[PDB]
Amino acid sequence: KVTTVVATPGQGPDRPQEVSYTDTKVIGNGSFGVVYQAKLCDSGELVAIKKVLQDKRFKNRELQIMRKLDHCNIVRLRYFFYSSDEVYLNLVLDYVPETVYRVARHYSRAKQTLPVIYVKLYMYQLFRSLAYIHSFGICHRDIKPQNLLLDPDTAVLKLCDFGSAKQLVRGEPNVSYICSRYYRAPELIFGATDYTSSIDVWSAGCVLAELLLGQPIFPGDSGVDQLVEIIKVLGTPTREQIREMNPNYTEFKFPQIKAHPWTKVFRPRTPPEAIALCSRLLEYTPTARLTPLEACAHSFFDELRDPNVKLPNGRDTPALFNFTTQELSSNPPLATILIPPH
Amino acid sequence: SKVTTVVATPGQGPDRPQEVSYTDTKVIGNGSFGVVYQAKLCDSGELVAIKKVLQDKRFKNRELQIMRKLDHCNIVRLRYFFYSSDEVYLNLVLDYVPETVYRVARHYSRAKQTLPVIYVKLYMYQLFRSLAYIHSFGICHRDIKPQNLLLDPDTAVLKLCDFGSAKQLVRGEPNVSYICSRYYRAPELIFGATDYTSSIDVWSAGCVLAELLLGQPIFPGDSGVDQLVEIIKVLGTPTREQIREMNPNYTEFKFPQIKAHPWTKVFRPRTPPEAIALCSRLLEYTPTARLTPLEACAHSFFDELRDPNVKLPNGRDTPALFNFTTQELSSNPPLATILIPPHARIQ
C-alpha cells in the first residue's frame, strides 16, 4: 500500500513535490497526535511522519520554527503536508533509530552504566543544538531523554519535538506549565511566568546527571517531591535565590536541608570534570547556569577534542566542530577552545 | 528477624503511650518522604505500616498534627507514632491495608477487564466521604491519587492515606501551587494558582472516577502542556471567565481552540449515564462550580449503594456507608434526606 502526498520541502523555496511512501508503521502516540514511520519510495530512506491537528486560527508555530531550523543536531524537517471533518498538519521528519531514553533504560535494566565517552558525545551535541536554537532566542521547553534522538552507528544525537518550543521575548510572559517531570527547572515548578532559556540548560543538566547516575537525579510525580529531591542535593535555597526564581514564593515552608557534597551524589568512579559540569548546570539562580556554548567548551568535553579520539565501534567521531558564526554568537572568543587544530 | 520494642504514643486519644513491639519489618515503599515499612505487631499479630520521616528541628510535624485530629472509617488509622534515631525521625505507625486502587485498577487493565461498576460506586463513594469529612475541618489533601487510596478487597472498604501534602486552607493565605501529582492536578494547579480551594481534591477524585470507568487515565501527559491539551480535548477551550476563575494572568494566552467533546462519547458504550454525569459535574473548569464532596456522595450514581438489598459479589455485606456524624454533614445537613436511606433509620 503506497501513499503519494504532495509535500512542501522543509527548507528553501515553498515548492511542493510529489512524495511517495510505503510500509507505514506506528512509532508513537502523544498529546499532539500520532507519529508514524514510513519508507520513502524515491530513496528507501526511512522517515518519521508526525500528524498534528491545525487550528484554523493561527499558523502552526512548530512548523514555523522547524522551517527555520538548520543544524546537524536538530531533527531535519524533510517535508510537511496536509491531510484529511477537519485538517491535520503532517511533519515528515528524518527517522533516527534510537533515543537517549531507550538507550539509557537498556543500560539501566542491565545494571551497568552508559560509558562516559557516550555521555560526552551525546551531551556535547545536546548543548550544541541548544546553543543553536538559543541564539535565535528559541527555547525548547521540553528537553527530556525521549526527545534526544540517537544514531548508534554514527553517535549522532538529534534534538526533536518542537511542539512546546518558543521564541522568548523579554517582558512578554510565557506559560509556567511546560517541561516534563524530573526535568522542570525550579523556577518552573514555582510556576514562574518569566523564566529564561536557561530552563533548557537546567533540563540538560538533569539529563547529564541521569546518564551518570542510571536514574533521574530529581524524581517525583509531584512538584513537591521533585523540589524535595532537588534540595537534598543542592541544599535549601536562599531568600536571594528564591527571589531570582519566583517572588512571593519567599517566606514559605522549606526543608532546612544542608547542601550535599556533589562528589558524594555519584558513583566513586565518576569523573571530577563530569561532576563539575553537572554542578554548573543544576544551579538555583537561572543566570548562574552555564550557557550551552559555555558548556560545550567545558573540560568535561576535552576528550572529544583529542586528535586521536575514535568511536567504540571503530568509526570516526561525528561532525563536532563545524560551528557557524551564529552558533558562536553567544561568545565568539570561545571558538579558540571549541574549534581544535583538526 | 529481630523484635524491635518501642514505647510509642497512640494516635487518637490522650497522650498515654504503650510498649509496642514488632518483627518481620520489611520495605513497603520509598519516596521523597523517607521509607515506608511493613511490620507484624507481636501483641495482636496485626499487620502494620511504619512510615519514617526526618523530623524538622524547627517545628512540630504538620502531617502528625493533621493525623492526630482525624478519626474516620475511610481515613487510614494512625495506630501509634514515635521518634527514632545524626538527627531524629518520626515514625507514623499506620494500620496495614493490603491493597490500593492503583494496584487493583492495574490488574483489571492488565487483564483487559474493567472494574465492575459496583466497586466503582462503592470505592468512589467512600473517597467522597473522607473528602467531605476532612474538608469539614478545612483540611485539603492536595494529593489525591490511586496510590493514596488503600483498599481491603474483602470488605471493600477504602481508606485515604498520605497526608504528607495536606494543609488547612485559610482564605487569603497563599499555598504552593506545585502540590498534587501527574494526571490528577486540577487545572488551576497546572496554571500555578497560589489561591486554590479544596475543590482541587474534588477534581482529582473526578479523575480517579473517570480512570476506573475508562480503564486508563483521562488526562495523561508528563507535562502540564500535554495534560492541558487532554483536558481541553474533553472539556473544550475554557472561556475568558473560566480562565480568570482558575488564574488571571493566563486570561490572555494562546490556547488550543477545540470545540467541546460530548461526554457520552468520552467513555465506553456500556458505561452508565449516571457515572458519565457525576464526572462532568466534578471535572469543571470553574473551581466554585464542582460538586461538594458531600453532594457527590448524594448523587444519582450511588443510589444503588443506598439500596437495602445491595450485596458484595463475595456475598459479604457492604461496609458501613451511612453512619454520618454532624461534623461530616456540616457542609450541608439537609442532604441527610438523601444520604441516610430509610432502612438506615430503622432501629
Reduced 3-state DSSP string for chain A: CCEEEEEEECCCCCCCEEEEEEEEEEEEEECCEEEEEEEECCCCCEEEEEEEECCCCCCCHHHHHHCCCCCCCECCEEEEEEECCCCEEEEEEECCCEEHHHHHHHHHHCCCCCCHHHHHHHHHHHHHHHHHHHHCCEECCCCCHHHEEEECCCCEEEECCCCCCEECCCCCCCCCCCCECCCCCHHHHCCCCCCCCHHHHHHHHHHHHHHHHCCCCCCCCEHHHHHHHHHHHHCCCCHHHHHCCCCCCCCCCCCCCCCCCHHHHCCCCCCHHHHHHHHHHCCCCCCCCCCHHHHHCCHHHHHHHCCCCECCCCCECCCCCCCCCCCCCCCHHHHHHHCCCC
If phi over 0 gives left and psi between -120 and 50 gives alpha, with beta otherwise, what is residue B25? beta
d(CA A239, CA B54): 23
d(CA B180, CA B183): 9
Residue A25 forms beta bridges with which residues?
Answer: A37
Q: How far is A281 from chain B (nearest CA, A)?
A: 21
- Chain B CB within 8 Å of residue A57 CB: yes
Same domain for B112 and B78: no
Same domain for A176 and A35: no
Mapped to the 3 state alphabet, what secondary structure does chain B carry?
A: CCCEEEEEEECCCCCCCEEEEEEEEEEEEEECCEEEEEEEECCCCCEEEEEEEECCCCCCCHHHHHHCCCCCCCECCEEEEEEECCCCEEEEEEECCCEEHHHHHHHHHHHCCCCCHHHHHHHHHHHHHHHHHHHCCCEECCCCCHHHEEEECCCCEEEECCHHHCEECCCCCCCCCCCCECCCCCHHHHCCCCCCCCHHHHHHHHHHHHHHHHCCCCCCCCEHHHHHHHHHHHHCCCCHHHHHHHCCCCCCCCCCCCCCCCHHHHCCCCCCHHHHHHHHHHCCCCHHHCCCHHHHHCCHHHCHHHCCCCECCCCCECCCCCCCCHHHHCCCHHHHHHHCCHHHCCC
Same domain for B210 and B65: no
Same domain for B247 and B218: yes
Strands A77-83 and A46-53: what pairing?
A: unpaired
Same domain for A187 and A119: yes
Residue B34 forms beta bridges with which residues?
Answer: B31, B53
From the list B143, B154, B222, B303, the catalytic residue is: B143
To the query of whether residue B143 is one of the catalytic residues in this protein, the response is yes
The CATH number of whichever domain residue B70 belongs to comes to 3.30.200.20
User: Which of B165, B250, B256 is the closest to A224 by Cβ?
Assistant: B165
Looking at A97, A118, A147, the residue that finishes a domain is A97
Same domain for A108 and A29: no
Contact B182 A181 (CB under 8 A): yes
Residue A19 burial (CB < 10 Å; 0-12/13-18/19+)?
A: buried
Evaluate whether residue A7 is within a structural domain.
Answer: no
Same domain for A233 and A151: yes
- Chain A CB within 8 Å of residue B178 CB: yes
Task: Give, in degrees to the nearest 5, the angle at Cα B328 between B162 and B159.
Answer: 30
The CATH number of whichever domain residue B189 belongs to comes to 1.10.510.10
Looking at B65, B98, B131, the residue that finishes a domain is B98
Evaluate whether residue B346 is within a structural domain.
Answer: no
C-alpha distances in angstroms, A153 versus A104, A129, B176? Answer: 16, 20, 46
Evaluate whether residue B44 is within a structural domain.
Answer: yes
d(CA B77, CA A23): 58
From the list A55, A70, A85, A142, the catalytic residue is: A142
Same domain for A40 and A23: yes
Q: Is the dihedral of CA A181, A182, A187, A189 positive or negative?
A: positive
Residue in the structure block whose three cell numbers are 558548556? A295
Same domain for B139 and B266: yes
Contact B257 A57 (CB under 8 A): yes
Q: What is the experimental resolution, given in Å to one decimal place?
A: 2.7
Same domain for B66 and B185: no
Evaluate whether residue A5 is within a structural domain.
Answer: no
Strands B149-152 and B99-100: what pairing?
A: antiparallel
Task: Label residues A277-301 b or e (16+ Cβ within 10 Å = b).
Answer: bbebbbbbbbeebbbbbbbbbbebb
A chain contacts of residue B181, beta-carbon cutoff 8 Å: 221-222
Evaluate whether residue A304 is within a structural domain.
Answer: yes
Looking at A73, A97, A121, the residue that finishes a domain is A97
Same domain for A252 and A142: yes
C-alpha distances in angstroms, A200 versus A22, A131, A292, B37, B171? Answer: 36, 10, 9, 38, 36
For B301, half-sphere exposure in the C-beta direction (CA atoms, 13 angstrom radius) is 28
Evaluate whether residue B11 is within a structural domain.
Answer: no
* Residue contacts between A and B (CB atoms, under 8 Å): 93
Q: Are A65 and A85 in contact (CB under 8 A)?
A: no
Domain of residue A162 covers 98-342
Radius of gyration of chain B (CA): 21
d(CA B265, CA B275): 13
- Chain B CB within 8 Å of residue A189 CB: yes
Q: Which residue type occupies B60? A: K
Contact B225 A178 (CB under 8 A): yes
Long-range pairs, A44-49, Cβ under 8 A, ≥24: A45/A94, A45/A95, A46/A95, A47/A21, A47/A78, A47/A92, A47/A93, A47/A94, A47/A95, A48/A75, A48/A92, A48/A93, A48/A94, A48/A95, A48/A96, A49/A21, A49/A24, A49/A90, A49/A91, A49/A92, A49/A93
Q: Which of B48, B46, B52 is nearest to B38 (CA)?
A: B48
The answer to the question of whether B33 is labelled as a binding residue is: yes
- CB contact set of B67 (below 8 Å; sequence gap of 6+): B11, B78, B81, B92, B163
Evaluate whether residue A13 is within a structural domain.
Answer: no
Contact B222 A57 (CB under 8 A): no
d(CA B142, CA A66): 39
Candidates A224, A251, A254, A260: best to mutate against B (most CBs of B within 10 A) is A224
d(CA A262, CA A123): 19
Nearest CA in chain B to A186: B178
Q: Which of B122, B112, B181 is nearest to B146 (CA)?
A: B181
Same domain for B83 and B130: no
**Count of structural domains, chain B:** 2
Calculate the dihedral angle through the C-alpha atoms of B96, B101, B106, B111, rounding to the nearest 10 degrees: 100
d(CA A165, CA A129): 13
- Chain B CB within 8 Å of residue A223 CB: yes
The answer to the question of whether B224 is labelled as a binding residue is: no
Evaluate whether residue B322 is within a structural domain.
Answer: no
User: Which of B56, B192, B226 is the closest to A31 by Cβ?
Assistant: B226
